[PDB]
Amino acid sequence: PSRLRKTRKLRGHVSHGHGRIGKHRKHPGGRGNAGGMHHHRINFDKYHPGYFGKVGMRHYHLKRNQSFCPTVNLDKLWTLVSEQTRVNAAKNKTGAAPIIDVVRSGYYKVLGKGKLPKQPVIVKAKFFSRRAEEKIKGVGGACVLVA
Amino acid sequence: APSRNGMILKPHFHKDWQRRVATWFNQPARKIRRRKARQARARRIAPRPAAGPIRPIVRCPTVRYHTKVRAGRGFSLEELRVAGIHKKVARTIGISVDPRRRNKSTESLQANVQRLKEYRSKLVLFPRKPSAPKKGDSSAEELKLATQLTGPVMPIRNVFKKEKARVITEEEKNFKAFASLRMARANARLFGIRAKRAKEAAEQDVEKKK
RNA sequence: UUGGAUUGUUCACCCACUAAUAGGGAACGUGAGCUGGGUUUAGACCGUCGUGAGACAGGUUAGUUUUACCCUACUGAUGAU
RNA sequence: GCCUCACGAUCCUUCUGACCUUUUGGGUUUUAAGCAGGAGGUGUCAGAAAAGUUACCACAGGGAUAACUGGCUUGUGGCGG
RNA sequence: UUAGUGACGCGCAUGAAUGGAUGAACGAGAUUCCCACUGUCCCUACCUACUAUCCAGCGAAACCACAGCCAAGGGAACGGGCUUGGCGGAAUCAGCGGGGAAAGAAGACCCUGUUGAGCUUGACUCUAGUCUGGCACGGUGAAGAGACGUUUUUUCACUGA
RNA sequence: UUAAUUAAAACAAAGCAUCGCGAAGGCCCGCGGCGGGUGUUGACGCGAUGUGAUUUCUGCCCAGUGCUCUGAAUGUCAAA
RNA sequence: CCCAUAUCCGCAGCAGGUCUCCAAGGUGAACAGCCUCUGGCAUGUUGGAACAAUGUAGGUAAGGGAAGUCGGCAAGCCGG
RNA sequence: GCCGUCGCUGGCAGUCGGCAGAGCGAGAAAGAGAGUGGCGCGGACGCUACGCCGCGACGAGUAGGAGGGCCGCUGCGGUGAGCCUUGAAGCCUAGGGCGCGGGCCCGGGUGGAGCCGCCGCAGGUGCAGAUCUUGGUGGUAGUAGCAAAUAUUCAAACGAGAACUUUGAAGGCCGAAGUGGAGAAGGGUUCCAUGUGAACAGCAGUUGAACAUGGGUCAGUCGGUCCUGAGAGAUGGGCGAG
RNA sequence: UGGAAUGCGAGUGCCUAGUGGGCCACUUUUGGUAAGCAGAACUGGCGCUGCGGGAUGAACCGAACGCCGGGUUAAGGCGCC
RNA sequence: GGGCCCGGGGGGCCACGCGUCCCCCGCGAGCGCACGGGGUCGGCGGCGAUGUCGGCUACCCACCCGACCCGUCUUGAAACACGGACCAAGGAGUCUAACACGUGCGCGAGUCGGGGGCUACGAAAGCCGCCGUGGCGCAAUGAAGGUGAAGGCCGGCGGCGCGCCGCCGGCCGAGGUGGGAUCCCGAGGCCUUCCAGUCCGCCGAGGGCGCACCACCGGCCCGUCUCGCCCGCCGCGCCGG
RNA sequence: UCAGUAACGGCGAGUGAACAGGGAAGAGCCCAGCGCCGAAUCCCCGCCCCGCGGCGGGGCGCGGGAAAUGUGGCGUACGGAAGACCCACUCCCCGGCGCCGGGGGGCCCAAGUCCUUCUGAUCGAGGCCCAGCCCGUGGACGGUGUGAGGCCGGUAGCGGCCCCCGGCGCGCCGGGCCCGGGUCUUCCCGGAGUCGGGUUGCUUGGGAAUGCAGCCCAAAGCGGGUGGUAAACUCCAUCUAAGGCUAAAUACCGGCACGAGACCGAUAGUCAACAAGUACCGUAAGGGAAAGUUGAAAAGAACUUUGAAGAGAGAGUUCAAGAGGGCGUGAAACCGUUAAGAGGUAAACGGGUGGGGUCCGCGCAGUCCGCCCGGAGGAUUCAACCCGGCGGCGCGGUCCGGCCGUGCCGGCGGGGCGGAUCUCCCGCUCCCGUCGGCGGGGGACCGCCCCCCGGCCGGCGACCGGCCGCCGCCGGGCGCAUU
Ligand SMILES: [Mg+2]
Ligand SMILES: [Mg+2]
Ligand SMILES: [Mg+2]
Ligand SMILES: [Mg+2]
Ligand SMILES: [Mg+2]
Ligand SMILES: [Mg+2]
Ligand SMILES: [Mg+2]
Ligand SMILES: [Mg+2]
Ligand SMILES: [Mg+2]
Ligand SMILES: [Mg+2]
Ligand SMILES: [Mg+2]
Ligand SMILES: [Mg+2]
Ligand SMILES: [Mg+2]
Ligand SMILES: [Mg+2]
Ligand SMILES: [Mg+2]
Ligand SMILES: [Mg+2]
Ligand SMILES: [Mg+2]
Ligand SMILES: [Mg+2]
Ligand SMILES: [Mg+2]
Ligand SMILES: [Mg+2]
Ligand SMILES: [Mg+2]
Ligand SMILES: [Mg+2]
Ligand SMILES: [Mg+2]
Ligand SMILES: [Mg+2]
Ligand SMILES: [Mg+2]
Ligand SMILES: [Mg+2]
Ligand SMILES: [Mg+2]
Ligand SMILES: [Mg+2]
Ligand SMILES: [Mg+2]
Ligand SMILES: [Mg+2]
Ligand SMILES: [Mg+2]
Ligand SMILES: [Mg+2]
Ligand SMILES: [Mg+2]
Ligand SMILES: [Mg+2]
Ligand SMILES: [Mg+2]
Ligand SMILES: [Mg+2]
Ligand SMILES: [Mg+2]
Ligand SMILES: [Mg+2]
Ligand SMILES: [Mg+2]
Ligand SMILES: [Mg+2]
Ligand SMILES: [Mg+2]
Ligand SMILES: [Mg+2]
Ligand SMILES: [Mg+2]
Ligand SMILES: [Mg+2]
Ligand SMILES: [Mg+2]
Ligand SMILES: [Mg+2]
Ligand SMILES: [Mg+2]
Ligand SMILES: [Mg+2]
Ligand SMILES: [Mg+2]
Ligand SMILES: [Mg+2]
Ligand SMILES: [Mg+2]
Ligand SMILES: [Mg+2]
Ligand SMILES: [Mg+2]
Ligand SMILES: [Mg+2]
Ligand SMILES: [Mg+2]
Ligand SMILES: [Mg+2]
Ligand SMILES: [Mg+2]
Ligand SMILES: [Mg+2]
Ligand SMILES: [Mg+2]
Ligand SMILES: [Mg+2]
Ligand SMILES: [Mg+2]
Ligand SMILES: [Mg+2]
Ligand SMILES: [Mg+2]
Ligand SMILES: [Mg+2]
Ligand SMILES: [Mg+2]
Ligand SMILES: [Mg+2]
Ligand SMILES: [Mg+2]
Ligand SMILES: [Mg+2]
Ligand SMILES: [Mg+2]
Ligand SMILES: [Mg+2]
Ligand SMILES: [Mg+2]
Ligand SMILES: [Mg+2]
Ligand SMILES: [Mg+2]
Ligand SMILES: [Mg+2]
Ligand SMILES: [Mg+2]
Ligand SMILES: [Mg+2]
Ligand SMILES: [Mg+2]
Ligand SMILES: [Mg+2]
Ligand SMILES: [Mg+2]
Ligand SMILES: [Mg+2]
Ligand SMILES: [Mg+2]
Ligand SMILES: [Mg+2]
Ligand SMILES: [Mg+2]
Ligand SMILES: [Mg+2]
Ligand SMILES: [Mg+2]
Ligand SMILES: [Mg+2]
Ligand SMILES: [Mg+2]
Ligand SMILES: [Mg+2]
Ligand SMILES: [Mg+2]
Ligand SMILES: [Mg+2]
Ligand SMILES: [Mg+2]
Ligand SMILES: [Mg+2]
Ligand SMILES: [Mg+2]
Ligand SMILES: [Mg+2]
Ligand SMILES: [Mg+2]
Ligand SMILES: [Mg+2]
Ligand SMILES: [Mg+2]
Ligand SMILES: [Mg+2]
Ligand SMILES: [Mg+2]
Ligand SMILES: [Mg+2]
Ligand SMILES: [Mg+2]
Ligand SMILES: [Mg+2]
Ligand SMILES: [Mg+2]
Ligand SMILES: [Mg+2]
Ligand SMILES: [Mg+2]
Ligand SMILES: [Mg+2]
Ligand SMILES: [Mg+2]
């Protein structure tokens, strides 16, 4: 609201907070990003390294659906199934492992950050990282590849 | 002028954007107008379903969405042919037809054929002349109970096949998913070049032979 | 502490008279005091310069000079204590 | 090179390098684009691509800045020990 | 006699249709001198008309921070105001042009502006027009020279575009 | 002749001298065409310049910059 | 009907501008200037009283005669 | 002495009452500890804790920043069993006051119909300037001025009123290239009669081209009308996105 | 025996306006005849700042400022103003 | 002079019980005055209804001291710098978008229905949950193809020859160093007739767990470089690790 | 939403889509061609019946023309046609006629002008028995001499009545159609100076060229186009260009008719609240204002008198002209007059006093309060006890009854929600009547919650009743006076 802003406090103060010497003039320095390679060079180099120039290949007609690959780490793996799924498997004696289907939860690749609980599991997924596969195998699990 | 740290911004306000501002103050009015036309349309076509013709099941394209099924545009002529519904008769009884759509696989085809057979089983058909029933018209006892259906006809849902826990076999334990994945990429990558090298070697060896 | 010829001239020089023909300031006194000869708009000529448009502390000719009734000062004129 | 100088961004082009990556539905091959390192140059040398004239002139300003007076100074000029 | 005229000419920098030299007549063109004439002047005076003037009626405007006596001082280096002195007496009339660095117009001069415009060219980038070659409209027939019955080209004709 | 600061020595002028053109042409207009002006014209004409009555004369220079003329003899030279 | 020092255009009853026809006597070369008749007007958007300066517009000046001034500007001389 | 700011990131929930017992500021850690053996019916204020209280130091300010306004303006949600024809807003006031101030309260007058406090919300929200915009008013000032083109005077009339109107008489001027008599263009009723004397006619007016009320333009022969002029301009055609 | 004196609570992070014409003096100091000239170092000023004194004065001397009473002073003064 | 002004043979002491052992030789009462944690009088007098009393400020006037006209640019303005004759009313940092940081609220590894739909004020509000599509966040890195976030100990075997590498089974397990608010223990200690010994509290040398945060050292992930020896197989590879 | 992204760009400044996904809406079709049907087709004129303000339906003409240089029917890429065999068929439309159930217009529908009272007039204030004037499905708003649910218009109402238009239904007459599905057999099948290519210019995010256009070249038929880096070879995928129609969801500062607003309030808001695109300016294109308010009601000031009149003095209307026709209020600047004060350093100004005014204290013998002493009086007379009511508290050391634990335990408890925890019934479907899969359902189990019952502890200070006790207060008695 306008009643809480500086203008109400700047009534009677001539310059309105812009100074008597420099004044508030229209566009000193240029408009927008003018001067980036010129009188504004220090700001751009100091705060925006890399801004000027070109790097890497072009790709025409990029379709971001083709590279769709949501990832999940192993430390969040057991959140995809219910809590009773884990405890029932942990306490059961037959040794049956539950199937966790990451694609059903909306993930494609499984990544290795984290530590799994000491509990066998069967993991279905399109992709696995190397370390994810070993951590899943270290607890007695198995990796299953889906398409 | 830039001032200390910040983001570099490029607002697209270098045209006469104020000459083409679209406000939305008529939004409540549109919602009432569209609602008032859904109701007036539902009354007009009653007891036919207000949602409209039944739509088939289709799988969304691309790898981001091919795990989902949704309502298509219309049943394919192959799906209607397998279900024994004439394509010109299909629309007259609330079935949507899409002559463009193809059937590449049988499962999707049979999924929509069962859909059409289930819908045909729920169809209550009023005789063209009320006093003179005909061969396929529903019996009077089930015409009394006919009531307009709200919401999409036989809504389409994504149902997941629950797999129960099973003992892991030594063969699954020994499978190497990452090594398999990396070698599969490499074989696809080098398949063409490997055959070209193989073909030259055959020619290279043959020339010495003969 | 002057009258004059030449010069827009300041300056200069000469003629002549004279006691003498001293030197200066006052916003280089003084343009709502004048004049406008010179300089310093627009026209035009010559020379030198410039391919040119044009330029020249180089010549030449023609080229609008506004207002006071206010305050003060000053000059006079009524008057006031 | 005894030391303190002897030199040049982005974009673009050109060369060198890899059993390199990509060249878009797949494969081969030309081509093209990438990645790393040199060079082609900006001497106004942190790097626009650039001739005049205006007295026919214009606008925004400037006493930050020249053309009078005034002010400080007095080399020069003048005058005096 | 820094003027004029006539001569002189190593002419800063004269000169031949960027025309040179001349010359009658002509000129509201520039300049010098002479006669005549005169208030241009010595050196001013008087007279006439209309004003100004005073009155009755009627009646603006420019301009204005507040204002309105000076000397010096210091001060944004020339004060109406300030400091120190000189001093100061209502309300007004006719004149006057010293001052108000008076009014008039955001200085035309000069500079600056990454503000212009008219004009020029050996500036930069273009462009109408124009010259030139190719392709199409675009054909018929004889010869010559080529190339492997076809095909390119030169000349000469034809007519139907 | 610069209406409203310049009436002039400036402009014009007759005279003089160059230059282009014989019509599918010269010079010019026009976005456009079987368009238009000169032209109801035809070289004693039309178009483009310079000088500026008469008198007398108008010298030398084609290196420069222009303009112009010759070209398969012939370097460079686009598309096709 | 006005047709222009008041009917038009210049902001106005503005000394500006705005196309025509008729055209007496005298003097005189004369449609010059000066006076008059026919016709017209009331002094130009006011009057009264004074007769200072300074003006604007007219004049006249002894003796000299451009000594004035940038310059004979202005006035004057001449005049049929 | 008083005001505010800052600091002590100071103190106060202990108003623990007759179900009582009043203290914890004092140089120097930690209990006004608990136990086991050897008559009256009484006692101020406080504490919106966003409150209240104490102690010490400090206080210049352009540009600029920040805080607090129980400063002010308009409208919206709530609230004030708000105010008001027994008088709202507005305005005026040598009336009484409050606040450092921005401002506000009350008294008196005028006025004639609406208005305000508080908690929140919102903003086209606060003027001395901008050669600011629009409107109004000053001094100048009863001043400049009402001076181009020779000129008026006498008598009478109407009338409230006469330098200016009308009539008569004088003296003058334009002096047939006119201040005369008629037209074109332009005007558009200004023409004519009667009336008025508000406004206008830069004095006045008994007057006017002003105002008001009514009238006035008559054609075979005078023009237009017709012709063609320089020129303009359709069709056919051409061009052209149109 | 926190290992010299003295004084004082410190560290750290975000966001940030105005400014980017200065000028003056002691001392040092460049150019210049010099300049109230131009150009540097150090510190302090004026700019932004009143107040007592230097009659007057941006910068000198004293001293820095909430609204007051009493006392005393600084630099400067005490013929009269 | 110094030694509670050492020891022996008229004037002031913030000496003044005693049993002693012996160096040496824990509460008296009252009363009162005050140079005592900032002023009181338990002291008085005159005047007052028609001309007098009080009234800061305000209206007018006088006097003494002070005192240049504001706004503005400016090193410097009272300036002979510009705007301003006077009065009223109007009159200039806004709204949209994006971003950053700070603050407040909600929920929280999630969060957000904004588009859509359902059911006078109300164009509001309520709801959706198989409307969460989707945005942002939860993963980075590389131009890209792509890859994509701790280890150790015990036992056994194979190879090299007690140490190293590879493959097998069991146990522990998200690093450490310095600082670090707070918390924890507690050597000893917090009195009343005197001793013993308790319950609750309370203080505290020293010693511990150490938040956030900082510095430092390790580790892990992706690009790239150097060195180098192995391991896998439906593809024995210019394969993959 | 993708997305300020892929991309474009002196790769600077800047620019910048699409696909997928979720929604709004949803609708599909027709020719040429290739063929078959005796042109089976169409227009117009004349006569008869019907209708006739949307010019049409039927019948009859050796009536006219169009059209084989191609009309109509079938049929169009989803394939289509003809034939054969099986199977199935009577409603679908056109032009007339009659009968039965949203829109526009008109008229109407509750309750105070009750009693006092203020006012110029009021709609104001006060009141209207228990109970609470009356109506209320109407307390929106406007009007009326303030300020009004009830005075009037209205407002409310699945209220009423009366006209007209429409929509939806049901019958009769005269016409048209003589209509389909499947399996086999045989046949047929497509748009050219267009595509495509070169080049030029423009355009796009489209980059060895996204779209468009000019000129040149100029097609094919298992072809052609697209497949986001030029090109050759090769597989694939996907469409079928150069003919055509099509509602809806979308847009809307003009127009007609309406509703609303945290908007402005006569220098604002449109330029325009009013005889405003007016007056006025310009030759013209154009430019373009100012300007709202008496009063409740004109009751708008008769009449007398001075003056030529304008103007005045009286008089009168009105609540008020101290509202007098550009009249509500009526500011400042500026001006007149009256009163007071003052006046030779322009005026004004800060500080300090002093003098004089105007008014204020609605001043002028000077405060109020508690307790106590004394003198005069007077009483709805004090304490203490008794009856009743209410309240507070109670560790009632541990009284009864309640609700109740965002408490803990025991249950053959009677249930809802959820679960990526397990598992007898059925629908479709492959295979032989068998037997396996998808989908729809019990049931069990786990977690949480609600309700029932028993045992401990436990609150009632956001959550209480009865008795008992103590205390306080109130009403009534008695106390009758050293209180
Ligand atoms: Mg400030
Ligand atoms: Mg600021
Ligand atoms: Mg400013
Ligand atoms: Mg600046
Ligand atoms: Mg600056
Ligand atoms: Mg800005
Ligand atoms: Mg900045
Ligand atoms: Mg001078
Ligand atoms: Mg002068
Ligand atoms: Mg002059
Ligand atoms: Mg001159
Ligand atoms: Mg000149
Ligand atoms: Mg030359
Ligand atoms: Mg060497
Ligand atoms: Mg660049
Ligand atoms: Mg391909
Ligand atoms: Mg010139
Ligand atoms: Mg010049
Ligand atoms: Mg000078
Ligand atoms: Mg000397
Ligand atoms: Mg001479
Ligand atoms: Mg000579
Ligand atoms: Mg020659
Ligand atoms: Mg020459
Ligand atoms: Mg007079
Ligand atoms: Mg002055
Ligand atoms: Mg003074
Ligand atoms: Mg003067
Ligand atoms: Mg001047
Ligand atoms: Mg200027
Ligand atoms: Mg100028
Ligand atoms: Mg610059
Ligand atoms: Mg230019
Ligand atoms: Mg131009
Ligand atoms: Mg060139
Ligand atoms: Mg002229
Ligand atoms: Mg002239
Ligand atoms: Mg020539
Ligand atoms: Mg030559
Ligand atoms: Mg006269
Ligand atoms: Mg007269
Ligand atoms: Mg006249
Ligand atoms: Mg006159
Ligand atoms: Mg004489
Ligand atoms: Mg004589
Ligand atoms: Mg002379
Ligand atoms: Mg002389
Ligand atoms: Mg003369
Ligand atoms: Mg301060
Ligand atoms: Mg007053
Ligand atoms: Mg009223
Ligand atoms: Mg507003
Ligand atoms: Mg204002
Ligand atoms: Mg103002
Ligand atoms: Mg006068
Ligand atoms: Mg005439
Ligand atoms: Mg006449
Ligand atoms: Mg008059
Ligand atoms: Mg007349
Ligand atoms: Mg034409
Ligand atoms: Mg200096
Ligand atoms: Mg400054
Ligand atoms: Mg400072
Ligand atoms: Mg100071
Ligand atoms: Mg001095
Ligand atoms: Mg003192
Ligand atoms: Mg002194
Ligand atoms: Mg003084
Ligand atoms: Mg300024
Ligand atoms: Mg300056
Ligand atoms: Mg100033
Ligand atoms: Mg000065
Ligand atoms: Mg200026
Ligand atoms: Mg001014
Ligand atoms: Mg935040
Ligand atoms: Mg609404
Ligand atoms: Mg994004
Ligand atoms: Mg664009
Ligand atoms: Mg899409
Ligand atoms: Mg939908
Ligand atoms: Mg056909
Ligand atoms: Mg199709
Ligand atoms: Mg009613
Ligand atoms: Mg009532
Ligand atoms: Mg009402
Ligand atoms: Mg009403
Ligand atoms: Mg009522
Ligand atoms: Mg009613
Ligand atoms: Mg109704
Ligand atoms: Mg087609
Ligand atoms: Mg273009
Ligand atoms: Mg473009
Ligand atoms: Mg490709
Ligand atoms: Mg269409
Ligand atoms: Mg108005
Ligand atoms: Mg308006
Ligand atoms: Mg107004
Ligand atoms: Mg207003
Ligand atoms: Mg107006
Ligand atoms: Mg008004
Ligand atoms: Mg009144
Ligand atoms: Mg009134
Ligand atoms: Mg009224
Ligand atoms: Mg009014
Ligand atoms: Mg009034
Ligand atoms: Mg007065
Ligand atoms: Mg007086």
Side-chain angles (χ1 to χ4, degrees):
Chain A
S2 57
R3 74 184 172 279
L4 297 178
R5 298 210 287 251
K6 283 186 73 162
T7 300
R8 312 315 311 165
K9 294 297 180 80
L10 281 164
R11 282 292 192 244
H13 296 257
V14 192
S15 284
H16 205 88
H18 296 281
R20 299 183 165 282
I21 294 153
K23 308 172 172 84
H24 191 189
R25 288 276 160 85
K26 305 292 287 211
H27 278 281
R31 301 226 202 189
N33 305 132
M37 299 228 81
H38 298 297
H39 60 275
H40 291 152
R41 171 181 280 219
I42 297 183
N43 189 289
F44 275 69
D45 288 11
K46 176 163 184 157
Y47 296 107
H48 300 102
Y51 177 84
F52 292 110
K54 312 203 299 200
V55 164
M57 314 190 278
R58 289 169 304 161
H59 188 72
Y60 317 138
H61 193 224
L62 177 66
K63 289 168 281 168
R64 289 201 183 279
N65 270 11
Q66 296 193 272
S67 50
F68 185 76
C69 186
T71 65
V72 64
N73 290 303
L74 284 178
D75 52 9
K76 280 200 196 184
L77 185 69
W78 279 104
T79 62
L80 308 187
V81 299
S82 73
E83 236 276 356
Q84 74 173 334
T85 290
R86 212 192 64 267
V87 311
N88 280 351
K91 86 190 146 35
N92 89 334
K93 305 190 165 186
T94 166
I99 286 70
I100 303 186
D101 182 21
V102 311
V103 174
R104 164 172 179 188
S105 285
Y107 308 102
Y108 286 4
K109 187 162 190 177
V110 174
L111 292 181
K113 192 200 194 191
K115 70 169 193 321
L116 290 171
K118 274 302 316 203
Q119 189 185 334
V121 54
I122 302 160
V123 187
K124 296 184 167 180
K126 295 191 183 208
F127 306 103
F128 290 92
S129 77
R130 183 179 60 80
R131 292 161 194 80
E133 215 218 326
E134 297 155 2
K135 282 178 184 188
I136 284 161
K137 280 184 183 174
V139 304
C143 287
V144 179
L145 286 172
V146 304
Chain B
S3 192
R4 309 193 218 255
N5 205 350
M7 193 163 310
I8 283 167
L9 301 166
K10 287 188 180 178
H12 286 52
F13 293 117
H14 296 92
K15 295 174 192 182
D16 206 4
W17 64 275
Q18 299 198 164
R19 248 178 101 229
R20 305 176 298 279
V21 167
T23 50
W24 276 59
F25 300 127
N26 63 332
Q27 174 186 22
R30 185 198 307 283
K31 289 173 84 71
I32 293 161
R33 187 187 299 119
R34 285 170 173 191
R35 180 157 175 261
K36 261 152 69 74
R38 275 186 289 275
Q39 293 165 349
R41 186 193 164 91
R43 284 181 234 123
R44 186 170 62 86
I45 80 182
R48 300 173 200 76
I54 179 174
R55 308 294 180 158
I57 306 158
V58 307
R59 201 153 279 273
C60 308
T62 85
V63 298
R64 174 175 187 191
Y65 292 109
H66 63 183
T67 51
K68 304 287 192 78
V69 291
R70 59 171 173 71
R73 182 192 174 76
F75 289 83
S76 69
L77 303 184
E78 187 165 6
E79 288 158 5
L80 295 163
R81 200 191 324 290
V82 173
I85 297 152
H86 195 287
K87 74 178 178 177
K88 298 183 181 183
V89 174
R91 291 188 186 88
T92 72
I93 56 169
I95 297 166
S96 59
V97 182
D98 190 358
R100 274 181 294 275
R101 187 155 68 76
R102 84 187 74 81
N103 284 123
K104 283 180 77 179
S105 51
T106 72
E107 287 75 4
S108 63
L109 162 59
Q110 292 304 318
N112 278 317
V113 165
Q114 298 338 311
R115 193 160 166 74
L116 278 160
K117 285 177 175 174
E118 186 183 339
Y119 169 86
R120 200 89 191 51
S121 90
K122 300 161 165 188
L123 192 73
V124 184
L125 194 50
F126 287 77
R128 278 211 54 67
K129 186 60 64 69
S131 325
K134 286 294 187 282
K135 189 162 189 173
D137 309 357
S138 305
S139 70
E141 299 76 6
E142 54 186 340
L143 293 196
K144 286 137 25 168
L145 300 194
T147 167
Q148 175 164 59
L149 184 74
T150 61
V153 174
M154 328 222 299
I156 295 155
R157 291 181 11 228
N158 283 267
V159 284
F160 295 101
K161 195 144 307 309
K162 164 69 153 184
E163 329 101 311
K164 58 169 170 176
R166 57 165 202 272
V167 303
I168 311 185
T169 79
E170 305 301 295
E171 307 47 39
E172 293 159 330
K173 290 166 166 278
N174 252 277
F175 178 74
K176 307 191 205 300
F178 174 75
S180 177
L181 278 165
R182 292 292 299 151
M183 260 174 311
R185 292 185 185 269
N187 287 333
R189 190 181 79 231
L190 304 174
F191 181 82
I193 189 59
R194 283 194 221 211
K196 185 228 187 190
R197 291 172 194 153
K199 174 179 283 292
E200 288 169 342
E203 174 255 323
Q204 194 96 355
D205 181 84
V206 155
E207 53 165 9
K208 297 177 181 181
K209 276 182 168 166
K210 290 187 180 181

